Amino acid sequence: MGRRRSHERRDLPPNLYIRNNGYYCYRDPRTGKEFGLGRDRRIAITEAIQANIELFSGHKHKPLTARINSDNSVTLHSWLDRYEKILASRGIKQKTLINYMSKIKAIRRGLPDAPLEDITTKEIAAMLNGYIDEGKAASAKLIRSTLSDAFREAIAEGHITTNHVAATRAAKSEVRRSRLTADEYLKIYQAAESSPCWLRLAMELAVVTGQRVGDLCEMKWSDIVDGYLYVEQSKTGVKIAIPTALHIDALGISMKETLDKCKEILGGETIIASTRREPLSSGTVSRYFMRARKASGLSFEGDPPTFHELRSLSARLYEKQISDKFAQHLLGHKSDTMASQYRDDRGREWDKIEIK
């Protein structure tokens, strides 16, 4: 070219130059233009050096102890962009798709821009374990699973031949979400006086019906017919009818009695509405339930319970109250694996055995 080397680029990276005004500008290998970035020297070079994370521009790579096997191909950061175009055609609910994007985004700021047959299993483990040392173990499991299905679909499109991610293991969580007893229940309901009125009503309604907080904010006064409570879960899709004759003596809460309270005080189209006579979100209900938790002053071991824990407390109560098969059909749950993993205590209460 006209200017191969100079006494100005002599202290600058391949991209980025310096004008006659002491200013610096970084070139663009897509049009041949540039933008002015920096007035200093050690700043423009320390800025036009991370985009420079990809001089492929000479240099190759090799760690301590390893083999060789390569040839030629294309980028990969782009594959993460084409993978998102495939997931949007798999027909997924509008909530699960977002869960995947968040993970793919973490993969972006985790692994270096690199071809696909370059990212070795060791590189994926360095990033994976990085989240484990931070405590986030449940995250590393989802990030690994997602990054695993991405390469699987990649191999099915003539790009890769192996799945290095399948080589590394996945973290094993322990679920440190403490449960909620019946005694701590009244302790929170008593401190829910400073909070709105719909909170206490939806708090008892969430323990008398044992439904999800999401479907709890979807019930209307038209879903009640002949004394039944037609509820259509959105998560699974199961359909059940809850009788308005239920009752919890362990807390002294009647089903019908609780329902009527939401018809006078609250009032509206939905069973649980706001002070403005409007339906609330599933993130605001469990939100205020937290305030009464912290304001209480009680202490636990691990992670404080939640509004969803009310569903668990509801199941444990109905167990000893009536039967076991009763606290299974009401929760809109089937199978025979979670019915037991939802009755446990997880280091809280001793499993006392009685003469029976």
């Binding site: 080397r5 002599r10 202290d11 050690r42 070079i45 320390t46 050096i49």
Partner: protein, 54 residues
């Protein structure tokens, strides 16, 4: 994991004089820069040399 200027020069293809090691930092010939912490640079576990020319 961050190392010192002495510990870093010990884990390279060829250990040179401390003077030369300090020179590379000043000339910005290592990704990423050491960043002076008090009165002694702190290399990154992945900070390798690059070398320029004209």
């Amino acid at each position: 994991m961050y190392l010192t200027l002495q510990e870093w020069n010990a884990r390279q293809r060829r250990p040179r004089s401390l003077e030369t090691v300090r020179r590379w930092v000043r000339e910005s010939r290592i990704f990423p820069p050491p960043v002076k912490d008090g009165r002694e640079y702190l290399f990154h576990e992945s900070a390798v040399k690059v070398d320029l020319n004209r």
